[model samples]
Target: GSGEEDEKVLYSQRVKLFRFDAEVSQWKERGLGNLKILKNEVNGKLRMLMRREQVLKVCANHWITTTMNLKPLSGSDRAWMWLASDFSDGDAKLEQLAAKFKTPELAEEFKQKFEECQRLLLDIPLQTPK
Candidate 1:
């Protein structure tokens, strides 16, 4: 159904998922790339049914998952259900170091030093997959 039915440039936003206007300067590029799909039309003014299909495409991954979790990018709204925070294991270790040394300065020191020394943190390897 992609590119088959009539499409319209409804709205756009600079989301963390798709390329936004900040990523480009051309109008043609923005309309085709960043022009967020607002709704699909069939029969040919059916807004609700067409909107549902459009939504499913954004939310459904078609079960394809390699590195990215492809959903309509729920962002911080979805993160509310998750227990994960910004605190890493290394942050905790450094907090302990600061306590033992009696200073928050030591915490920052331990963190930077550990990263600079090994290009690693808390024995964890940094990786990115696509």
Candidate 2:
């Protein structure tokens, strides 16, 4: 089975992703897909995953960390920006990622769920029972 079979979807919504290109000094369209937050049932680890529609290429893939800050784009209530050590390209690279939802409500929903996952991860004990 694919690894997704071992995880439960905590949050999912249709969204468009963007990556800030430092050299070009502009945002580049990553893909349009259903962005999802999945929690592994066995380990309780949570990660975010988004794949391109039709092509199904992973555009965003990374663990949700406590240090992440989901900030709303200035003047827009339907989008957010964040940083992640993304592994979507098959190599871990620091990326400035942004996601835009269909509506402001959906954007808020994602922000709440993302922060909730971050808090949950922080609550996990450092040592696990043997």
Candidate 3:
């Protein structure tokens, strides 16, 4: 089960995710799952998480930072690409991730919600004074 009981879903959509393979110089399929942007009610932080359909393995898990840019994949309006410090593999590492939706409209919707998360994070101070 997804241990996200304390977080609320701001956006949820079924999409295929990809990771740019520097070794092969091509994008490789990560997994197909319901990509969700969840907001933590207690901490007021936002993060994105995606788990593979049946296996339920996490493909993407990272916070939405203001520095991250969501750009449309070249020659595809249905996909958006961005850089993130992903931790889905256990230890966090910077990864170039892309998500493709069923429709162009859905892709746009994801982008809008993603940006919204970034903006919300910006409102919170990076470090609270002790």
lDDT of 1 by residue, 18-130 (tens): 21122342111101112133332321211111111223222101111121121111222221111111121112111100011123353345334423433332234332232
Rank the models by TM-score, top first: 3, 2, 1
Rank ordering of all candidates by lDDT, starting from the highest = 3, 2, 1
The collision pairs in model 1 are none
| TM-score of each model, in listed order | 0.21, 0.74, 0.75
lDDT of 3 by residue, 1-130 (tens): 2343456766666788888778976567787888776666643556777777776777787666677777777788758778887776634767777888888788877678768757775675433333
Per-residue lDDT of 5-59 in model 2, one digit per residue for the tens?
5667666767888786888765666878877767666534567778777667777
Name the TM-score of candidate 3: 0.75
Global lDDT of each model? 0.21, 0.71, 0.71
The predicted structure with the larger TM-score, 2 or 3, is 3
Root-mean-square deviation of candidate 3 = 6.0
Best by TM-score: 3
The weakest ten consecutive residues by lDDT in model 3 span: 121-130
Q: Root-mean-square deviation of each candidate, in angstroms?
A: 21.7, 5.2, 6.0
